Amino acid sequence: GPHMFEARLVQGSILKKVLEALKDLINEACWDISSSGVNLQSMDSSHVSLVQLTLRSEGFDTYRCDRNLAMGVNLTSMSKILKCAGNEDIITLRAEDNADTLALVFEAPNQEKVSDYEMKLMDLDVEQLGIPEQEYSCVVKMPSGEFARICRDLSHIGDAVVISCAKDGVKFSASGELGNGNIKLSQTSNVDKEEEAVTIEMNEPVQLTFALRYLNFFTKATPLSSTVTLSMSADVPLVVEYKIADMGHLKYYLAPKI
Amino acid sequence: HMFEARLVQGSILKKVLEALKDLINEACWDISSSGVNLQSMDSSHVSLVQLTLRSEGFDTYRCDRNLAMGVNLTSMSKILKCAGNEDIITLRAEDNADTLALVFEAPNQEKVSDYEMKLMDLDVEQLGIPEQEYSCVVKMPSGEFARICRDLSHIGDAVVISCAKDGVKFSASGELGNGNIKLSQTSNVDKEEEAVTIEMNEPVQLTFALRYLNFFTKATPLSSTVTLSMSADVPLVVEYKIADMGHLKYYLAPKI
């Protein structure tokens, strides 16, 4: 009858974390909902970085989407509400087309407790995503807690970081009034569990500079992925990518300096 | 002529003060043969808190004369942060002078601290709390109730409590939207103290200030369960059983 969108996710906490990963950088955004899945795509208010989020429908335990629809969300409101959900809660979303409210329903495992929140939506016009899939001079894959530790540490030294990678490894550098710091990461040839590995794919050495404010925001994704992947070219934007396992990915895009 | 109570589970005394300190700046402690009795309104007269510690619950209880010791709850809390959690704690007073003595002992027995706190002169102020039946009484885990007030406070500043025979709902509104939380009565002899139990003589639908409920949930460490007693036009009672030894009761009136 009415055109429904409805998604049941048993590991609700994924959705929770996803919002932690967004709320501090994006205030509001359109969710593109189709049968492919849930797709989100927005630039932060200072127009320097772009987040893009993909939750494929097969990732959801239940998924229905009668026709493509788009919902303007206040990620701040959405985050507040998701803090009301249990880490073990089963989470359902539910809206009809042209809705002014989103239903979020949180089910405890025992089925003796149930919460529901009707969240106000907004009307937002969101177009575009003229993002060509592209070839990078360097791709680097490493533990997400390590990358996060690095950004955390270099942000005591300075507020920009030079990334420089070669065949053998990648180096991160900052500098300020305290002093200079250089963190160097070499390829784990070895033989290991992917959450400790360091792997480099390379066509040509890049050496690029990025502001560490932004990087430090991207790292709020850290709970979503054991790894994180960085892709670099001359003055193409850097992309920082987290695999939300068996559901999709979360990619941040940053513009280098000069 | 002297008062002295020794409490082994001294932590209880800590949790009790952590639960009052934020609501109440000063209260009078009524001491008598039958135990300890504290009653107070909060600084703005909206709510009332009542605390009973029966003398049977102490390992040692001695009370020559009835006293009313005026205490600053915030100083007394500072002094009890200095007690370890496994500390055997003793209260001691001399009727004359107004000093209360808090003695802490390590169960190792190699360390002993005494703190002498100054007392105030306060107004002796009881309010008569009436014996009562309630239309609905909800027993639930103190943590779930605590979670519920916290979450709804992100939604609005009032919570509507709708109580049926075999479930209760907690709803809020505000600029973000609505929220509703439904607990069903539990089968039980599952578990024990994660049972939700409703006794309903008369269905209620009552509105309360989340501002105050969240002060009440500070007592959550004192008990695994909380009880809610409700009627139309009658203060809500939020009760925390302290061990085998007493209770902390909070009173808050509903809309109209």
Binding site: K80 | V46, I129, C149, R150, S153, D157, A209, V234, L252
Partner: peptide
């Protein structure tokens, strides 16, 4: 979730209106 700061509502009657001394 830390607990929001919520103001005392308009309709709030004091407990003194229910119990006497």
């Amino acid at each position: 979730a830390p607990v929001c700061v919520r103001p005392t509502p308009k309709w709030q009657k004091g407990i003194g209106e229910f119990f006497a001394a």
